[PDB]
Write an enzyme that holds these catalytic residues in place. Structure first.
Site, short mmCIF file in Angstrom:
data_model
loop_
_atom_site.label_atom_id
_atom_site.label_comp_id
_atom_site.label_asym_id
_atom_site.label_seq_id
_atom_site.Cartn_x
_atom_site.Cartn_y
_atom_site.Cartn_z
CB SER A 1 -31.93 -19.77 -2.60
OG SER A 1 -30.49 -19.72 -2.81
N1 LIG Z 1 -27.34 -18.82 -0.78
C1 LIG Z 1 -28.37 -17.90 -0.43
C2 LIG Z 1 -29.77 -18.37 -0.33
C3 LIG Z 1 -30.20 -17.69 -1.50
C4 LIG Z 1 -29.91 -18.36 -2.78
O1 LIG Z 1 -28.51 -18.41 -3.01
O2 LIG Z 1 -30.56 -17.56 -3.82
C5 LIG Z 1 -28.17 -17.25 0.58
O3 LIG Z 1 -27.71 -17.98 1.50
O4 LIG Z 1 -28.09 -16.07 0.32
#
Ligand SMILES: N[C@@H](CCC(O)O)C(=O)O
Lengths: 535, 216
Positions: A1
């Site tokens: 992310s």
């Molecule tokens: N999907 C993530 C954001 C972080 C990413 O996946 O590294 C989260 O909502 O935890």
């Protein structure tokens, strides 16, 4: 992310701008949905998780905007337990104490029910190995160990008016560890590690550790006010992208494993170069495809020198000349990816690591992929020329063999077509005649798991993208209707809806659509309107 | 005919006043309520109109009931969440929440269950499976949230290093981790860099020895 926040002294608007994109597997329908929800207490727009009320991680309320990347805090320990009593007792210090044993059953569509034992020690449940053999692994995780009050935060966050009020409202959040980046109409930006982390030794980060010795027990929780945070840094830029949050000499142990810093460094580079960052500039950062490995690859392939096999030598030459960009239009990016998959497979096979998962302690669903893990360690071993795991081969011999194998795997497709995801609905393999209807359409896309446009893959399976940005967004803090967002298929979960796969077109172009906040604009633009009424 | 109605008016038992739901050109719902309980009732109803199969499949995956829809491929994942005690820890958490969060969750599932009672045609996946939707309890949302983030991160790296020990030995197994580019860029302070600590084989020696014995 990925995410980032730029302070008012470095934006074109003179207000904060926040932007980013969470990366997860492309399970269908998408994990995150776009919604705007208003009442007398709050008026919030952002991403929701269908089945859960409120906006846990990505939203603004007209005063504070916030978003997250996974922080890679170490919130799960494995303990190696000594059992006796035919698995009915477990050692703690010098006493063997009773273990909890119960029976449960699941039903399986098309097959027999399965009955199984649930065995629990003072640490947590047994997840791998057979206690009857005398040893097994238990899991102690923040996600299960003690009462969690994360849902009390969902009613407190909507009322926050500043970055600091939002971080006080997140007290007690422990379900998932996040880098919570925020910005507010007062002009502040900030990063909080929003997580609950137990206080215990750094050794617990490396391996399952002895459950009996008393040396590896959790000694309480790291307090809220001790967790890393920064508000309004002097350089006016925050970036998080799953990279190491604090140095390892920080006094609390927080992290062993995290992503490499490639994506954070590339976002930071682009932002340091633009001290008049505009809302329109976020898309170009989302779309960045420069691979961090081009220099290492070029150096090692040049030093290797000309190959005897003509097809391998062609491949070597194209990789030495490559500009390193994982652009959708690049055919040589596909050849880089085939080469790196072949090298990862050869290293995983020669080392013996492919068979490491044959052990009973490996049996934790969905399992580890040896090539999938070796993939991320190869750059370090190749950069250090550490051939310790190659059983006698040099890295040069491995690179040469990889050129030969990869040369037979070149489809010549542009990387966008080679990497195009095959979005698979959960029922498509059970109802194959329905896969054309159930699977949302996909377009060619570039990137790999090392680039800011982080459309990653499963190296043991092939080049197709399996994970990447489920949504992209940019918040214009204090000019809210100029904010934007997109998701990778669409709002609808119904395969037959016009909105099942319509946002794949902007998302595949790294474009976004308006995140409309003003009610008069929303009313004027609505396509359907419904009244939900008292019964 | 196989999609739920998104225009007109629909009843929700328990609403205090009307809620207006407007979808934009991309189908995104903008929901405007008067009070907070009505807002969460509406959000549960609106999530179900667009995503009910996703909601129920994610709740089945949390509760160890997904192999009832997906077959044997999902059996080992169902057994693992039963062993982790999903229902027990989500009911635990719900009982300990403040009144405001209990009332949020109650209002939200009242919205979901009103959709299940609204007479809408079922989604195509319930036709394919020959399934009918099962009703929601307030603690179910806590299981869905817990499933979204289930076991991500550190536990897999530790498990992988342990599995590598009898194959490549301790010194090599303790280099099995994602690359750092030679030196991390840290998040805090912004722009700071540092070299990560490598494993101390001397302090890890009792753990390594115990695991090699246990594994052998
Ligand atoms: N999907 C993530 C954001 C972080 C990413 O996946 O590294 C989260 O909502 O935890």
């Amino acid at each position: 992310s990925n995410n980032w926040a730029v302070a008012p002294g470095r934006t074109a608007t003179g207000r904060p701008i926040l932007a980013g994109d969470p990366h997860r597997v492309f399970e269908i329908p998408g994990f995150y949905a776009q919604h705007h929800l208003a009442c007398d207490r709050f008026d919030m727009i952002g991403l929701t998780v269908p089945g859960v009320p409120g906006f846990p991680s990505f939203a603004h309320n007209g005063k504070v905007a916030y978003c997250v990347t996974s922080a890679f805090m170490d919130i799960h320990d494995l303990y190696l337990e000594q059992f006796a009593g035919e698995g009915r007792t477990a050692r703690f210090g010098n006493d063997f104490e009773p273990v909890a044993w119960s029976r449960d059953r699941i039903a399986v569509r098309g097959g027999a029910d399965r009955e199984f034992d649930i065995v629990e020690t003072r640490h947590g449940p047994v997840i791998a190995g057979d206690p009857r053999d005398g040893a097994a692994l238990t899991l102690r995780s923040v996600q299960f160990a003690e009462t969690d009050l994360s849902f009390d935060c969902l009613t407190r966050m909507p009322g926050a008016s500043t970055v600091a009020q939002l971080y006080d409202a997140t007290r007690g959040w422990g379900l998932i560890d996040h880098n919570l980046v925020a910005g507010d109409v007062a002009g502040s930006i900030g990063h909080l590690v929003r997580a609950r982390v137990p206080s215990r030794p750094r050794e617990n980060g490396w391996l399952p550790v002895p459950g009996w010795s008393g040396e590896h027990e959790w000694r309480g929780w790291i307090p809220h006010e001790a967790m890393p945070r920064v508000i309004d840094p002097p350089g006016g830029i925050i970036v998080t992208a799953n990279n190491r949050v604090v140095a390892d000499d920080h006094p609390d142990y927080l992290c062993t494993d995290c992503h490499p810093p490639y994506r954070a460094e590339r976002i930071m580079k682009r932002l340091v170069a633009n001290p008049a960052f505009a809302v329109d500039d976020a898309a170009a950062i989302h779309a960045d495809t420069l691979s961090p490995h081009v220099g290492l690859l070029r150096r090692r392939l040049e030093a290797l020198g000309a190959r005897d096999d003509s097809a391998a030598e062609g491949l070597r030459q194209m990789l030495v000349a490559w500009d390193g960009r994982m652009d959708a239009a690049s055919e040589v990016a596909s050849a880089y990816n085939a080469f790196r998959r072949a090298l990862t497979r050869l290293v995983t096979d020669r080392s013996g690591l492919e068979q490491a998962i044959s052990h009973p302690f490996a049996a934790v669903a969905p399992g580890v992929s040896p090539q999938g893990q070796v993939w991320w360690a190869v750059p370090t071993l190749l950069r250090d020329d550490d051939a310790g795991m190659l059983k006698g081969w040099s890295w040069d011999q491995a690179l040469s063999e990889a050129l030969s194998v990869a040369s037979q795997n070149l489809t010549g497709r542009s990387w966008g077509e080679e990497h195009r995801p095959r979005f698979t609905h959960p029922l498509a393999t059970q109802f194959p005649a329905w896969a054309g209807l159930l699977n949302p359409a996909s377009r060619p896309i570039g990137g790999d798991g090392d680039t800011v446009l982080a459309n990653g893959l499963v190296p043991s399976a092939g080049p197709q993208a399996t994970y990447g940005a489920l949504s992209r967004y940019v918040f214009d803090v204090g000019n809210w209707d100029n904010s934007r967002w997109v998701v990778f298929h669409g709002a609808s979960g119904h395969p037959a809806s016009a909105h099942y796969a319509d946002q794949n077109a902007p998302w595949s172009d790294c474009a976004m659509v308006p995140m409309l906040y003003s009610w008069d604009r929303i009313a004027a633009e609505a396509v359907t309107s419904q009244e939900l009424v008292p019964a | 005919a196989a999609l739920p109605p998104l225009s007109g008016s629909l009843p929700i038992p328990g609403l205090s006043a009307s809620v207006r739901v407007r979808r934009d050109a991309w189908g995104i719902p903008h929901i405007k309520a008067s009070g907070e309980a009505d807002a969460y009732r509406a959000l549960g109803f609106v999530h179900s109109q667009d995503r009910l199969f996703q909601m129920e499949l994610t709740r089945r995956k949390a509760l160890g009931r997904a192999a009832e829809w997906l077959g044997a491929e999902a059996a080992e994942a169902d057994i693992l969440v039963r062993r982790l005690g999903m229902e027990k820890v989500c009911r635990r958490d719900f009982e300990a929440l403040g009144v405001e969060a209990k009332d949020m969750l109650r209002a939200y599932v009242a919205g979901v269950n009103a959709f299940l009672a609204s007479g809408a045609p079922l989604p195509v996946e319930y036709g394919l499976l020959g399934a009918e939707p099962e009703p929601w309890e307030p603690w179910h949302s806590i299981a869905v949230m817990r499933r979204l983030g289930l076991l991500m991160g550190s536990v897999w790296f530790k498990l992988w290093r342990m599995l590598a020990l009898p194959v490549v030995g301790a010194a090599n197994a303790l280099k099995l981790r994602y690359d750092d580019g030679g030196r991390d860029l840290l998040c805090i302070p912004p722009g700071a860099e540092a070299d990560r600590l490598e494993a101390d084989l001397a302090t890890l020696r009792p753990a390594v020895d115990a695991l090699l014995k246990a594994m052998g």
